[PDB]
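Retro notes, item 3 of 5
We never archived the inputs for the magnesium ion complex last cycle. Fixing that now. Sequence and ligand:
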Amino acid sequence: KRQVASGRAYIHASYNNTIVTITDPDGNPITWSSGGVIGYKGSRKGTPYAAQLAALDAAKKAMAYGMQSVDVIVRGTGAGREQAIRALQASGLQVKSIVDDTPVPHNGCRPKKKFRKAS
Amino acid sequence: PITKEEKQKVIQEFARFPGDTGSTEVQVALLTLRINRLSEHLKVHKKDHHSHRGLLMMVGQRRRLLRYLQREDPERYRALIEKLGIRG
Amino acid sequence: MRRYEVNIVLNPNLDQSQLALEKEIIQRALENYGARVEKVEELGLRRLAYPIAKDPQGYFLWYQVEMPEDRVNDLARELRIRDNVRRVMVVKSQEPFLANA
Amino acid sequence: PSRKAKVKATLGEFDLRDYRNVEVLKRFLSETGKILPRRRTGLSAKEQRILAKTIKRARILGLLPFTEKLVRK
RNA sequence: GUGGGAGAGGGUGGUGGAAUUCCCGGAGUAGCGGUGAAAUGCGCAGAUACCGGGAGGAACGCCGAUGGCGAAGGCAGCCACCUGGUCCACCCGUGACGCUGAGGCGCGAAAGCGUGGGGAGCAAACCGGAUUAGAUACCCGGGUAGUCCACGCCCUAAACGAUGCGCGCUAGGUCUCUGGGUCUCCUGGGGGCCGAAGCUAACGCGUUAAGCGCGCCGCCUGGGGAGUACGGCCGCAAGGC
Ligand SMILES: [K+]
Ligand SMILES: [Mg+2]
Ligand SMILES: [Mg+2]
Ligand SMILES: [Mg+2]
Ligand SMILES: [Mg+2]
Ligand SMILES: [Mg+2]
Ligand SMILES: [Mg+2]
Ligand SMILES: [Mg+2]
Ligand SMILES: [Mg+2]
Ligand SMILES: [Mg+2]
Ligand SMILES: [Mg+2]
Ligand SMILES: [Mg+2]
Ligand SMILES: [Mg+2]
Ligand SMILES: [Mg+2]
Ligand SMILES: [Mg+2]
Ligand SMILES: [Mg+2]
Ligand SMILES: [Mg+2]
Ligand SMILES: [Mg+2]
Ligand SMILES: [Mg+2]
Ligand SMILES: [Mg+2]
Ligand SMILES: [Mg+2]
Ligand SMILES: [Mg+2]
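Structure as it came back at the time:
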C-alpha cells in the first residue's frame, strides 16, 4: 500500500558498510537495505560486492512498492559506493540524477585521534 | 582617533614660529596628546597589551626629547612642563 | 561623521501597510540615531541562495547614510529588534576598486 | 586542466568591491560554493584576497551560496 | 609635518553558515558500529540510514600561499567600534636629540593552581573489549579532570633561524608580497632559492652573512655525578630562578 513510482535513493557508504535507503520525493523512507541486511557479517560488509547486493536488494524491495524512476544522492566515500551506483545503474530502475552530498564541516568539531591531523 | 583638524590645532598652538612643524616643543606636545589618548583607551581594555607596549615606547620618546630640551634650554623646558603638566 | 551602507533584508510576504510600517520604523531608527540619509536603492523581493527564516526569498532595502561612529552599532542593533527584519548588515563605504579595466 | 580559460579574461570592467552584485560574483565560485583558486580566476594576490572578502559579505547577505551539491558523479 | 598604503598586530561588542552531540515530530525495519580479524558497545522502550523543527557548545571549509602581521609568545568566518607597529612619496620642520643596556618593570605557547560559570566534540586518570608468553601499551567501545569564558596565580619549552641588538662596507641571477616612477624596466621596504669575493673542521653561510669592520649586552672553559645537593629568593601548590 504505497504506489510511489518515483523517488529518492540514498547511498551512505563508509569504509565498514553500505546502506541504501530508498524513499519518496518528500524524503520519507519507502525501504532500506544494507550490508548486514544481506547475509554478510564481519568486515566483508564494506565490500563492493556486498554494496551491490545491498543496493540491489533495496531496488527489489522498492519495485515491490511499485517504484520506477529514482534520483540518487551519495553520502560518504569508501569502498564501493560506486559499485552501489552500478547496482542501481541498471537494477531495473531508471536513474534521473546523481549527486554528491557528502557532508563536510567548516571545522566545527575536533575529530577523534583516528582522524587527526585536522580540525 | 585623532582628526587632522585637532592635530593642527595643537601644532599651530605649540610652534616656535609660524611654519614650524617638527621642533622639540611641538613633538612633545603631539606625543603627549597621543599618550593621553592611549592611556584613556587603556583604562578600559586593561587586557590590550600589544597597544600598551606602543605606549611604553611613546613615553620613552617623550622623556628623551624632554631630556634633550632640558639639556639645552631650561626655561623653555619649564615652559613645556608647565603647559602639559608632565613630570608632575 | 562617517559614510556607511546599511543593508536591510525583510520578509517578502508583507502586505503594503506592513511594508510601509517597517520602512517607517527604519526611517525613525535612522532619525533617532542621528544619521543623515544620502541615498536609497530598493531592489525588493529577490531569490536568496539559501533559505533565511525558512524563507526561499528576501526583501531588499539599501541605504547609504552618514552618521556618527560612536553610535553605529547601537543603530544596527536597533534595526534588528524588529521581527520582520531578517538580516541587517552595516558596512563602511569605500570607493570602488576595479580589476580588468 | 584548471588553466583552460580564466575568469577575469571574460568579464569586462567591473567593481571587485561590490558584494551587492551577484551576477559578476557568481562567476568566481565553482560548481560548489567554493571560491576559486588563483589559477582559475587569474587575479593578482591583492585582487584575489579582495574578491574573497566581498564574496563572504555577499554570502552573509544571502546572495551567494555557502555551498552546493555536486551533480554528474 | 603633510599625502598615500598593505596587513590572521591587539582589545570590546555583535552576527553567519557548514558540521557533530542531544531533544521533538514524520516515515521505516533488523541491524548499526568497529577491526588485521574481532569482541565490548548501542538497537523491538524501534536504533542505524532518511526528511522536518528546536536547543546548545566549540571551531572557522573554499579563498590559503612557497602569503601576510607581530619584539617574542603568537595571530585566520563576517561586521562595527577602540587601538599599536610599520612602509613609501614630498625634502617641508627640529638640529646629534644617537646606539647598547648589568639591575628594575612588563609581556610571555602548553600543561598546571584558585574562585565562579559553561560544557557539544575531543580526552590524561579510570572502566571495559581485544592482541600478545605477559600487554598496566600500541587497536576498539566508554569516560572524569581538562580543553571554553571571567578574574587572579604560575614564568617553563626543540620559548629554534638551535644564529643578541645597532650602523657601515663587499658580484650577480632568480621567484615573490607591498609602496612610488619616465610602468619593458628602474627604485625603496619584507619574504625565499642559486651563487662572486671571503669565511668555515666540514656541512654549509654568502647585501635576510655564518664575509670585512666598530659599539654595547648575554654566555662558554672535558664527560658522568647534576640542573642534583646545601643556602637564599619567588610560588597557594605543583614547582621555578
Ligand atoms: K637557549
Ligand atoms: Mg564491518
Ligand atoms: Mg587582525
Ligand atoms: Mg544486547
Ligand atoms: Mg515488538
Ligand atoms: Mg546541553
Ligand atoms: Mg590549504
Ligand atoms: Mg612558531
Ligand atoms: Mg593602524
Ligand atoms: Mg629640510
Ligand atoms: Mg636652521
Ligand atoms: Mg604562561
Ligand atoms: Mg592554558
Ligand atoms: Mg581552572
Ligand atoms: Mg580510547
Ligand atoms: Mg623551528
Ligand atoms: Mg633576492
Ligand atoms: Mg628584495
Ligand atoms: Mg668560492
Ligand atoms: Mg648559498
Ligand atoms: Mg671533573
Ligand atoms: Mg627544572
